[PDB]
């Protein structure tokens, strides 16, 4: 099938309400002092506790 009518900019932007990405999900490393992903090793000094 082919579209019957042109899609307006109002309808197009409504459809993109939920099209987006999320936050990485990061925590602070208490050896590096810098940010890292949860349950992943630090990348500054390469340490993983626990």
């Amino acid at each position: 099938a082919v579209p019957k009518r042109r899609t307006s900019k109002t309808r197009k932007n409504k459809r993109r309400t939920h099209f987006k990405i999320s936050v990485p999900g990061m925590t602070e490393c208490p050896n590096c002092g810098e940010y890292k992903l949860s349950h992943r090793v630090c990348k500054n000094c390469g340490s993983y506790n626990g």
Partner: protein, 121 residues
Amino acid sequence: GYRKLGRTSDQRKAMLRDLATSLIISERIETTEARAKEVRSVVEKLITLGKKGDLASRRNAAKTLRNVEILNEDETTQTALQKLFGEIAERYTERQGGYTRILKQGPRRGDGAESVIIELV
């Protein structure tokens, strides 16, 4: 099976044999998260075989290991079945299970695949 890893039956068994053998040689390798959770069972059941030491245990482990040669030490060469029965199994005589540890790294460029580190405890 358990998880098919996007391979046929013959390819899956050949790839687990290659990953398991290379881990004995270097004791620390980097791979994919999904692959690492299936290598666990393969390597850990091979260490159980090397802790028995019988001839039948040796011949049942030669059906999974590959014929590589390790000239890493400065002394005489040895294969990967001599290292499994001689050195690795020597230092696990006390703990019962859990000879492998997995550490997460993160996504890799160009693929987004989760990278992990797998090593012997």
